[PDB]
Write a protein that binds this DNA or RNA. Structure first.
Ligand SMILES: [Zn+2]
Ligand SMILES: [Zn+2]
Ligand SMILES: [Zn+2]
Lengths: 290, 146, 118, 317, 55, 667, 121
RNA sequence: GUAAGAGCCUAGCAUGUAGAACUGGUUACCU
């Protein structure tokens, strides 16, 4: 079936740095790069030296996977789909073979058009449970180097007869002997062998993380960067969440606080919650083992 | 009736696709709230206004995409509970009295079987037809001989 | 095999007007042209619903029944020859009044088989 | 004895009209009691004078068996459907077909006119109903969701605007605007081949060989269950005096109270002379607009006309 | 140009529309090529109308 | 959604009937039945319809009675459909409307099947309801025939003798008549081949064949099955019977021998009309001048009427009792020959699925059925006329007289019946009534059939071909006399033997009010108008007319005006319709040769009657243009004219089609 | 006889349910553990909680395999003598002739006698 | 003895895409 819905579903690094946008709407302009059914193509210009970006996928194929219709990144975080499904589960299993894909698309289109039109129909309940490593490498400010005109292929042959007037960039393309160069549309969309997402996962795996209690039943927590401006009365008020708290040794000379819990499970849970995240009184509290 | 007439017009628009070929410039405005705020995004703003013009259609341009592609019927909506009665008990006698015998035809033998002759000629109606003579042939024959 | 019955028919809902008008096809037949593009309505003498609302139908029906029954009532030498008058009282024997629900024994079929087989 | 029913007078035959050369599969009465239509298996629609029982007109044009015939109350029209797959519109001003409604895949079994919008709703063997605009001859919607053939359809102006029983034993109450199902009533064990709407009380009944069931309209609430008439019933019709009529394929026809559901009369009528004892059967019945005649369309290729007995009470249970 | 773009979109390289709108096969056709390249009254009406106008 | 147009109609009917039965058996089964078994019941429905078309009684020994009743119901529905479609298509093929050739063959195949259903019904009802003949009446018929044969000193036909000197001539004549059948064609199956092989053996060794024929005539009384099919003449259907070759050779010799010994013995009096020395137009001419040569036939001064009656013996073939036929043939021939001829009519008739036994009527397709028909017709001529008037017409046996002649003037005017011919099963009687006889006979009719409302003038058919001055006028005396004469001739025949029907007959009265009597004979109708009656302009220029002279005075008294009957015109039109069918209809010389044969058949039969009929000339022009348009469409040629007519009308030796014209065409 | 797919179910159920023997130790253990909620109504709470130990599911699977085997023995194969004069040219033809002898064998018994005695009487 | 599977062989008609994620760490008491 056709798609035909007003006003596309876009992020903020593609919708532009100007709050005043003029876009055009073509009713059944292109076919979807995934669904292969025709949809409503919106064409806008973000800024001044930009590229006139347009939506690449259906409203439906963005409702399935909670993405922007042109950068194909998560609307909330701004990350590839393989990274977000790595920091979640993968239970969608959208078919890739032909007849199965059109059949699944038909049935999910009936599912979405038999509902409200507001939620990521399958990704919602798993989208509740979040804030994994993806939040610690989520991009803070927009990468406006995406919205940028392609390399002038006449300037690559040293024959750009437009010169100063050509709206395409006169700068180096990337060396093709690079994993970060191939990048199919469907590889970026299904979450399969995406090299950008591979590098983000390789960075987020070597992100500093918890170590286990090397010796048995030790719940002792070694707090460095405690600080002499905070109080121990607030420490218990943050720490009675976990369970039966045992003794808390405080040494304000080395800024180290020693913590004992009932079970080692509670110390591991505290390690999960506390490490490289917890900032109380606007001051970072570092916790270690040993 | 107001809901039906709109769908009627959208169906009937095919019957004359180009008679006074169409016109499109209601250039409109829409106010949009990015739900992404945390500002480095608009430039520091909370909303953005977008002017939508509809792209002007070429009169002389054929349909763009293949529409004849054909896919099997999807699943029906989830089954309703069946709400029947307890169910009348069935007897061996009535279960056997509703049995249907196989048709042995005088004409068709689709899978080319070989049927025993008594089975093949079990046309009882031409065996119970009982050609029965009248008793007024006797008066005729006797009167003619006399 | 090739020669086979149906035992299941085709289900409507998957073509040309069925779900999205076959995704809005630009194909249309000659029979799908504009024709009879104005509904006629019943006029005041025809049987307009205002005229049919106040009426008492049973009295008029009884009057028409009475008139029809009244119409049906008011409507209604060689003496030495070896055979005498065989047709004495045969006043044509009203077979052409009977209607018989059997296509081999209708009077129409008897006239048909008499007429078209020599 | 939980209720006491209203007393209804017995009905009796007084006229047997003959002249179709096929099973008479449908019947409908004109809004002004001047005539009635029948449609039959001999591919003719016959206009009969209602008072005198005389053949007024014979219209031809269907290629196969005429299954449903309805007369428009707003427009001077006559709608018919057949096993032809065809849905026709007859201009009675001219006695000629002016419009055909094309799109059903197999035999069209029924039709009903919407009482206020100029919308025609048909059923077919292709497990769908369709919703046609009369003026533009276009399918507005395709009511799909039954799994076997669809037997009957009724229309309203109030809520659920379209109601249909089918041969997959279910009943679907639909939305005319959206085109999707609102209520599925699975209570019947065999094929629902008749539904009938009440003129005042905002209920409907439906019939199948197991038993007949009454129902409140908004969400199909169960109200009652009327049993005793156990044959494949083809039609149900209601008198404004609360007389339900249930006729069946064995030729039997039982006359019921609507409110309490009391069987007060069983009429097992005799066949035509040439006819066969296995050929007794009713396919259609209608009340006239005076609601004092009962027109039945029989399987022995006849029309039977009944009226109330003027010999008062001989009755009461 | 319209008529032979219709010819070349249907991959009927064995037909030739000359400059006076006569449609002739370049070679001798198989049965499958002959059934593929049968046109209807629309194509031939437009072709003969264009023949009259070119005259 | 494909439409059910014309080639999908029967398939869609069978597609929908089967679905209706599917729905009914899903709703008919009770609550706990295994919900299989739909396919088996549908097979039983197919079998019940094939037994319906086969006229086989269909009964499955165990089968639940709701299933059996439902299958009988839907089979009756399909039977009504099949039969009403056959009625509609037959009325189309009769009226000339546009029909496919396939629906012509389909309609023939339905009609022969419906005929055999009715015929099995009729044979069963004969064996059930006794004879119709009512033994008193059969003794009356037999005794009348005995008194007639002893009155004429008839010498009964012996068995064909062992040293019959003429029998090889009869064998050569029989074999020539059998080999004239397979002369036109060249595509022959096994049975035709066997037939020609037996013919060649009978030529090559005649005495072995004669010994075999006489041995079959002595011994054989049980015979093989005969096939039946119909010839489609587009106005009616004709039964055609297929007999085994050996039996056919025996019947052919029996036919030749019986007609030879009947002519020597003068069995058939000269009113048995398809005679060897009289073509049918010569028969009409002889009948006209026989009316002219009656004494004072045209005088109406003292009140006299001339009545002409034309009718048939309606079901004469269909109602011959075979036991009574055995009795009458044992009166005529040897008892062995009579038993052979009787037992030969009792055969089994086959068409594809259908078999029954001819227990009552006679097979028209026998070689010697001609003799049975003319002799049973002689018996009923004796019934109509009576033995006295028939003995006056035939004359004495020592000096018998020819066709329309008496011995004396006094024996002409003895009775009202003056002339009488029977052409095979059609009757033609001429009546001369004096006023007293007419009054008495109308008194008897109005006694037996009173008419207070003067309704006798309503149902009286008059001929509409002739113009308004030319037809029979409708006067009360003449109308009642015509109906009374018909009544009196009708009473003379038992309805169990044959009957005479008013709707097929035409009566014509000539009186002081009627200046014309119309009659209809072999296929052209004619009216005779005398000069003493209202002519007023004694003319002789036209060629359609006949100036027929009185014999005695050698002067021309009356005129005879001829036209072609509408049935013969319609038969020619149907013949041309048959030519335009028949899929060898592209050959361009086959078409023209069939047209030329049909055209000279028409013309050389109806020679001078053709130009006096304008409707037949217009039909000839239209049919000629039809076959020319068929040739032109064979060249496709276009709608536009100036197709050169030299290609049609050139003689076939210069390369032309050889086409004969009967229309006003100019080059 | 058969009469119903539910009566055969009920017969099969009565067989299986007479065959089973409970162990009271696990029963009274679960009774003392669960207490008040061991006699539940329709709406109790415990629908989504029970986790069967390996021996329980092993007992279930063994019982179900026995049930499948007893069901697989439902049509016992009648032995194939080859002394009967065969009447079929195929393997499906034989079974169709067997069904035909089931249904029409009671009626076509005189004609069989005629065919064996020499098409007589 | 067909101009179609199959099945091979060589071919050429549509695209002008989306995308490029890259930085932080201290040690200490009584027997
Ligand atoms: Zn998409
Ligand atoms: Zn984006
Ligand atoms: Zn450049």
């Amino acid at each position: 079936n056709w798609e035909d819905a007003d006003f596309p579903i876009l992020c903020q690094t593609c919708l532009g740095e100007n709050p005043y946008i003029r876009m055009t709407k073509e009713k059944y302009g292109k076919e979807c790069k995934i669904c292969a059914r025709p949809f409503t193509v919106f064409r806008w210009c973000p800024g001044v030296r930009m590229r006139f970006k347009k939506t690449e996928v259906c409203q439906t194929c963005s409702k399935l996977k909670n993405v922007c219709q042109t950068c194909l990144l998560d609307l909330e975080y701004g990350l590839p789909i393989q990274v977000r499904d790595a920091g979640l589960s993968f239970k969608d299993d959208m078919p890739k073979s032909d007849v199965n894909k059109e059949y699944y698309t038909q049935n999910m289109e009936r599912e979405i058009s038999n509902s409200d039109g507001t939620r990521p129909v399958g990704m919602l309940g798993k989208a509740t449970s979040t804030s994994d490593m993806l939040l610690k490498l989520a991009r803070t400010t927009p990468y406006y180097k995406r919205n940028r005109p392609h390399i002038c292929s006449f300037w690559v042959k040293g024959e750009c007869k437009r010169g100063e007037e050509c709206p395409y960039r006169h700068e180096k393309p990337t060396d093709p002997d690079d994993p970060l160069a191939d990048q199919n549309i469907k590889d970026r969309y299904y979450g399969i062998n995406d090299p950008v997402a591979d590098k983000l996962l390789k960075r987020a795996s070597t992100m500093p993380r918890l170590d286990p209690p090397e010796d048995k039943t030790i719940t002792t927590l070694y707090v460095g960067g405690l600080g002499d401006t905070i109080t121990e009365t607030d420490l218990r008020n943050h720490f009675y969440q976990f369970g039966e708290i045992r003794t808390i040794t405080v040494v304000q000379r080395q800024q180290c606080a020693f913590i004992q819990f009932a079970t080692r499970q509670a110390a591991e849970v505290a390690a999960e919650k506390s490490f490289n995240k917890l900032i109380v009184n606007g001051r970072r509290l570092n916790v270690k083992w040993g | 009736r107001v809901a039906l007439e709109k769908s009627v017009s959208q169906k009937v628009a095919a019957a004359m696709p180009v008679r006074a070929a169409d016109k499109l410039a209601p250039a409109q405005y829409i106010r949009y709230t990015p739900s992404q705020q945390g500002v480095a995004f608009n430039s520091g703003a909370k909303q953005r206004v977008i002017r939508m013009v509809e792209m002007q259609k070429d009169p002389m341009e054929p349909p763009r995409f293949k529409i004849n592609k054909k896919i099997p019927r999807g699943p029906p909506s989830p089954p309703a509970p069946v709400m029947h009665s307890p169910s009348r008990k069935m007897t061996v006698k009535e279960q056997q009295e509703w049995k249907i015998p196989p048709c042995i035809s005088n004409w068709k033998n689709a899978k080319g079987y070989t049927i025993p002759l008594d089975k093949r000629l079990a046309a009882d109606g031409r065996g119970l037809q009982t050609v029965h003579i009248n008793e007024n042939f006797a008066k005729l024959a006797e009167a003619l001989y006399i | 095999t090739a020669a086979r019955p149906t035992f299941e028919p085709a289900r409507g809902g998957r073509g040309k007007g069925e779900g999205d008008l076959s995704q809005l096809s630009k194909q249309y037949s000659s029979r799908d042209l504009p024709s009879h593009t104005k509904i006629k309505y019943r006029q005041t003498t025809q049987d307009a619903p205002e005229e049919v609302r106040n009426r008492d139908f049973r009295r008029e029906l009884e009057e028409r029944e009475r008139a029809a029954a009244r119409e049906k009532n008011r409507d209604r030498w060689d003496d030495d020859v070896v055979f005498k008058n065989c047709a004495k009282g045969v006043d044509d024997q009203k077979k052409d009044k009977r209607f018989v629900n059997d296509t081999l024994r209708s009077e129409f079929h008897k006239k048909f088989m008499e007429k078209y087989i020599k | 004895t939980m209720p006491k029913p209203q007393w209804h007078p017995p009905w009796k035959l007084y006229r047997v009209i003959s002249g179709h050369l096929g099973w008479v599969r449908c019947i409908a009465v004109e809004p002004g009691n001047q005539w009635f239509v029948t449609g039959s298996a001999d591919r003719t629609i016959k206009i009969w004078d209602l008072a005198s029982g005389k053949l007024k007109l014979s219209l031809t044009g269907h290629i196969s068996t005429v299954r449903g015939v309805i007369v428009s109350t707003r427009s001077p029209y006559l709608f018919s459907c057949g096993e032809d797959k065809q849905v026709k519109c007859w201009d009675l001003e001219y006695n000629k077909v002016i419009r055909h409604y094309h799109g059903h895949l197999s035999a069209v079994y029924g039709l009903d006119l919407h009482p206020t919008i100029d919308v025609l709703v048909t059923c077919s063997r292709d497990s769908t109903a369709r919703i046609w605009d009369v003026r533009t001859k276009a399918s507005v919607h395709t009511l799909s969701g039954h799994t076997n053939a669809v037997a009957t359809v009724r229309c309203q102006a109030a809520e659920p605007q379209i109601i249909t029983g089918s041969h997959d034993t279910t009943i679907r109450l639909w939305d005319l605007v959206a085109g999707k199902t609102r209520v599925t009533l699975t209570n019947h064990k065999k094929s629902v081949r008749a539904v009938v709407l009440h003129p005042r009380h905002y209920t409907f009944a439906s019939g199948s060989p197991d038993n007949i069931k009454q129902w409140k309209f908004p969400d199909g609430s169960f109200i009652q269950n009327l049993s005793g008439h156990n044959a494949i019933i083809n039609t149900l019709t209601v008198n404004s005096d609360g007389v339900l009529v249930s006729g069946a394929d064995n030729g039997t026809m039982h006359l019921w109270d609507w409110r309490t559901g009391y069987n007060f009369q069983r009429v097992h009528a005799a066949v035509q002379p040439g006819s066969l004892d296995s050929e007794s059967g009713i396919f259609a019945c209608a009340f006239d607009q005076s609601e004092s005649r009962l027109l039945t369309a029989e399987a022995d290729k006849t029309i039977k006309v009944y009226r109330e007995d003027d010999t008062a009470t001989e009755e009461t249970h | 140009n319209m008529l032979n773009l219709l010819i070349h979109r249907k991959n009927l390289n064995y037909l030739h529309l000359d400059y006076n709108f006569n449609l002739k096969p370049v070679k001798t056709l198989t049965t499958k090529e002959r059934k593929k390249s049968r046109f209807g009254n629309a194509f031939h009406l437009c072709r003969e109308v264009l023949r009259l106008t070119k005259l | 959604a494909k439409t059910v147009t014309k080639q999908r109609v029967e398939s869609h009917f069978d597609l929908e009937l089967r679905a209706a039965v599917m729905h009914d058996i899903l709703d008919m089964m009770p609550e706990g039945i295994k919900q299989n078994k739909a396919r088996t019941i549908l097979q039983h429905l197919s079998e019940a319809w094939r037994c319906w078309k086969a006229n086989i009684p269909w009964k499955v020994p165990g089968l639940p009675t709701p299933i059996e009743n439902m299958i009988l119901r839907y089979v009756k529905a399909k039977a009504d459909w099949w039969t009403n479609t056959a009625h509609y298509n037959r009325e189309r093929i009769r009226r000339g409307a546009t029909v496919d050739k396939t629906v012509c063959k389909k309609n023939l195949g339905r009609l022969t099947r419906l005929y055999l259903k009715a015929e099995q019904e009729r044979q069963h009802n004969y064996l059930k309801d006794g004879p119709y003949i009512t033994a008193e009446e059969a003794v009356a018929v037999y005794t009348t025939t005995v008194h007639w044969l002893e009155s004429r000193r008839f010498s009964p036909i012996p068995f064909p003798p062992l040293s019959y000197k003429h029998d090889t001539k009869l064998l050569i004549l029989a074999l020539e008549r059998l080999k004239e059948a397979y002369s036109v064609k060249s595509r022959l199956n096994q049975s035709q081949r066997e037939e020609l092989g037996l013919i060649e053996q009978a030529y090559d060794n005649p005495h072995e064949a004669l010994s075999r024929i006489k041995r079959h005539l002595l011994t054989q009384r049980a015979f093989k099955e005969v096939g039946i099919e119909f010839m489609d003449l587009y106005s009616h259907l004709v039964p055609v019977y297929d007999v085994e070759p050996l039996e056919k050779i025996t019947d052919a010799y029996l036919d030749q021998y019986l007609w030879y010994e009947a002519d020597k013995r003068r069995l058939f009096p000269p009113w048995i009309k398809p005679a060897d020395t009289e073509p049918p137009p010569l028969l009409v001419y002889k009948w006209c001048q026989g009316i002219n040569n009656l004494q004072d036939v045209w005088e109406t001064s003292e009140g006299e009427c001339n009545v002409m009656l034309e009718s048939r013996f309606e079901k004469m073939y269909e109602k011959i009792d075979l036991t009574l036929l055995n009795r009458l043939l044992r009166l005529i021939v040897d008892h062995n020959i009579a038993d052979y001829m009787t037992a030969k009519n009792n055969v089994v008739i086959n068409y594809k699925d259908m078999n029954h036994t001819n227990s009552y009527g006679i097979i028209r397709g026998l070689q010697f059925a001609s003799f049975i028909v003319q002799y049973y017709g002689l018996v009923m001529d004796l019934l109509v006329l009576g033995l006295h008037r028939a003995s006056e017409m035939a004359g004495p046996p020592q000096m018998p007289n020819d066709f329309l002649s008496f011995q004396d003037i006094a024996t002409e005017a003895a009775h009202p019946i003056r002339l009488f011919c029977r052409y095979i099963d059609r009757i033609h009687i001429f009546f001369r009534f004096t006023a007293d006889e007419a009054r008495d006979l109308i008194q008897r009719y109005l006694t037996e059939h009173p008419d207070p409302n003067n309704e006798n003038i309503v149902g009286y058919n008059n001929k509409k071909c002739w113009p308004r001055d030319a037809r029979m006028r409708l006067m009360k005396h003449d109308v009642n006399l015509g109906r009374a004469v018909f009544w009196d001739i009708k009473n003379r025949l038992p309805r169990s033997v044959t009957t005479v029907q008013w709707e097929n007959s035409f009566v014509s009265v000539y009186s002081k009010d009627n200046p014309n009597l119309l009659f209809n004979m072999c296929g052209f109708e004619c009216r005779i108008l005398p000069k003493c009656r209202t002519s007023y302009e004694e003319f002789t220029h036209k060629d359609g007319v006949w100036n027929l002279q009185n014999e005695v005075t050698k002067e021309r008294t009356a005129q005879c005006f001829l036209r072609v009957d509408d049935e013969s015109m319609q038969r020619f039109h149907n013949r041309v319709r048959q030519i335009l069918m028949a899929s060898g209809s592209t050959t361009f010389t086959k078409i023209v040769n069939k047209w030329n044969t049909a055209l000279i058949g028409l013309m050389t039969y109806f020679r001078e009657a053709v130009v006096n009929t304008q409707e037949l000339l217009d039909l000839l022009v239209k049919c000629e243009n039809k076959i020319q348009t068929r040739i032109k469409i064979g060249l496709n040629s276009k709608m536009p004219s100036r197709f050169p007519p030299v290609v049609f009308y050139t003689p076939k030796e210069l390369g032309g089609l050889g086409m004969l014209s009967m229309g006003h065409v100019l080059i | 006889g058969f009469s119903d797919y539910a009566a055969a179910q009920l017969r099969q159920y009565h067989r299986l349910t007479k065959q089973i023997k409970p162990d009271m130790e696990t029963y009274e253990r679960l009774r003392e553990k669960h207490g008040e909620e061991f006699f539940p109504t329709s709406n109790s709470l415990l629908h989504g909680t029970h986790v069967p130990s390996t021996e329980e599911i092993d007992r279930m699977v063994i019982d179900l395999e026995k049930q499948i085997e007893k069901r697989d023995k439902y049509s016992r194969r009648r032995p194939y003598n080859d002394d009967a004069d065969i009447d079929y040219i195929n393997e499906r033809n034989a079974k169709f002739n067997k069904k035909a002898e089931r249904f029409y064998g009671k009626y076509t018994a005189e004609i069989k006698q005629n065919l064996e005695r020499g098409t007589a009487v």
